[PDB]
A paper describes a structure:
The nuclear retinoid X receptor (RXR) is a unique family of ligand-activated transcription factors, which in humans comprises of three members, namely, RXRα (NR2B1), RXRβ (NR2B2) and RXRγ (NR2B3). In addition, we discovered saturated fatty acids, including palmitic acid (PA), myristic acid (MA) and stearic acid (SA), as RXR modulators capable of inducing the recruitment of co-regulators to the RXR ligand-binding domain (LBD) and hence, activating the receptor.
We next questioned whether PA could also bind to the other two RXR isoforms and therefore, we crystallized and successfully determined the tertiary complex structures of both RXRβ and RXRγ with (exogenously added) PA and the GRIP-1 co-regulator peptide. Overall, binding of PA induced similarly an active state of RXRα, RXRβ and RXRγ. A detailed structural analysis showed that PA occupied identically the canonical ligand-binding site and engaged in similar interactions in all three RXR isoforms. We observed that although most changes were located peripherally at the surface of the proteins, there were three substitutions in the proximity of the ligand-binding pocket (site 3, site 11 and site 15 based on Figure 4a). Among them, a minor difference in the lipophilic residue at site 15 (α: Val374, β: Ile445, γ: Val375) located in helix 8 might affect interactions between helices 5 and 8. Since helix 5 is involved in ligand-binding site formation, this difference could allow contributions to subtype preference through differential ability of helix 5 movement in the RXR isoforms.
Residue numbers in the entry:
A (entry chain A), B (entry chain A): 298 to 312, 333 to 529
C (entry chain B), D (entry chain B): 471 to 483
Amino acid sequence: EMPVDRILEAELAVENDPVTNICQAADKQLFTLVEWAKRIPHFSSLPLDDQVILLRAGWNELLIASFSHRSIDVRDGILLATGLHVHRNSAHSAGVGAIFDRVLTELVSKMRDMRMDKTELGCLRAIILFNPDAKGLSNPSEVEVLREKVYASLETYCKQKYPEQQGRFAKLLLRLPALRSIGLKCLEHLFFFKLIGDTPIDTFLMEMLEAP
Amino acid sequence: EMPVDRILEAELAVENDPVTNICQAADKQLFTLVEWAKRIPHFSSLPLDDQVILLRAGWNELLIASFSHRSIDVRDGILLATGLHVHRNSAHSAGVGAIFDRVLTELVSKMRDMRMDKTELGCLRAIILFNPDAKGLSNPSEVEVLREKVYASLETYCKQKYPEQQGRFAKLLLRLPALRSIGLKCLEHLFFFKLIGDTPIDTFLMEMLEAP
Amino acid sequence: KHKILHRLLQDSS
Amino acid sequence: KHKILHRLLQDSS
Ligand SMILES: CCCCCCCCCCCCCCCC(=O)O
Ligand SMILES: CCCCCCCCCCCCCCCC(=O)O
Ligand SMILES: [Cl-]
Ligand SMILES: [Cl-]
C-alpha cells in the first residue's frame, strides 16, 4: 500500500555569489533527501544498489521540486534550505538567468497558481523517486509498481480534496516534463561549474557528479 | 472543443550510415509535421508567430513520439518514415547506442506493452504541441487552455475505450518526461553532428537547429 | 528567420 | 564508489 499520509509525513519531517550559495544548499539538502527517501513507503525495502540508482537518477529533480515549492510565496526568487533567498536579478547577474527564469515560470509560478499542496508535492517527488526507467535497476517492474501505487494514491487524494477540479491530477503530472528538462539543464550547469572550477562543490554534491 | 476523432484523423492523414538515414528521415518528416499540426483543432487559429514557436519547441519530441509508435512491432529497432528499419546493433556501431536504447526501453517497449493506440499517440502529440511553457508565446494562457482541452478529451477517451484500466491516462502522461529527456539528448547529438560536419543535414532540419 | 517553417504554415494550398 | 550515499542509506541510526 502507498498511503498519502506517510508521503506527507516524509515532507513535514525534513523541513556570497548565488551559484556558490545554491551549490552549498544542494550539498546540505542531499543529506536531507536520503532521510526523506527512507521515509517513503517501501523505498528502504528495495535492494541497496537500487536505492542508490534511484537517488542518483532523481536527486536533482527531487531538490528542484522541493526548493520550487518552498518558493511559492517569494517574489521572482527562490528560498534555499539555508534560509538564503535568491532573486532573479542576482541569478541573471551570475550568468544563470535563463535557467533561473525557467524555474520561476514553469515550476514556482505554476505551483503558486494551482496552490500545489505538500501532499501533492510529496506524491510528485515519490513518482520521481520511483523511476522505473533508471538504468541498472535489479527489477524495474518492482519500481514501476511502486510508481503506479503512488500515482493511484495521488489521483484518489486529488479527487477527494479538490473534487471541484477534474483536471488537477493531469495538471500535477504535466509539470514533470518541465522538471525533467530543468533538472537536465541544471545538471549541465553543475558539470560546467565542476569542469571550470568556478564554484566550491562540497563532497556529497561532488559525489553525485561522479561517473557511475 | 477538442474532439479526439479529429486528432486521430490528423495521425491517419500523414501516414548508408544510420545517423545519415535518421537525419534524412527527420528532414522529410518535418514537412509532414507542419501538415499534421495544421490538422490539430485550433492550431492554425493561433497567431503565425505562436505556431512557429510551438513547432520549433516541439518538433523533436513530436517526431520521436511518431517514429517510436511506428516501431512497436519492430524487434530492437525503429521504422523510419522512409521505410528504412534501424536496429540497435547499427545504432551502437554508429556511436549512438545509448540514446537508441533509451528510445527502445523507455518509449517503443512501453508503447508496445500498453498497446498505445493512435488516438492516444495523437493526443500526447497535441499535448506536446500545445506547450504553454514555449518561450515568447503572445498568449501562453490560450495554449494552456488548448492543452487542457486535449488532456480532458484524452482522459475521457481512455475512461471510455479502456474502462478496465483506471491508471492508463496517468501511464500515458508519465511517458512525457522520458520523451522530454530523450528529445533533449537527441537534440544534443544533432547539434554535435552539425558542429563536426559528420552528417549531411538537409535544409528544414538545419533551419530547426538555427538560433531563434 | 525560420523561412521554410513560416512559408509552410502561411500556405493554404 | 558513491561512498557517502551507500553509508547514509545503510545506516539505521
Ligand atoms: C535554480 C537555478 C540554478 C542555477 C545554477 C545551477 C545549479 C544547479 C543546482 C540545482 C539544485 C539546487 C538545490 C537547492 C536545495 C535547496 O536549497 O532546497
Ligand atoms: C533514435 C536515435 C537517434 C540517434 C541520432 C540522433 C539524431 C536525432 C534525430 C531525431 C529525430 C528523428 C526523426 C525520424 C523521423 C521518422 O522517420 O519518423
Ligand atoms: Cl501543463
Ligand atoms: Cl511511468
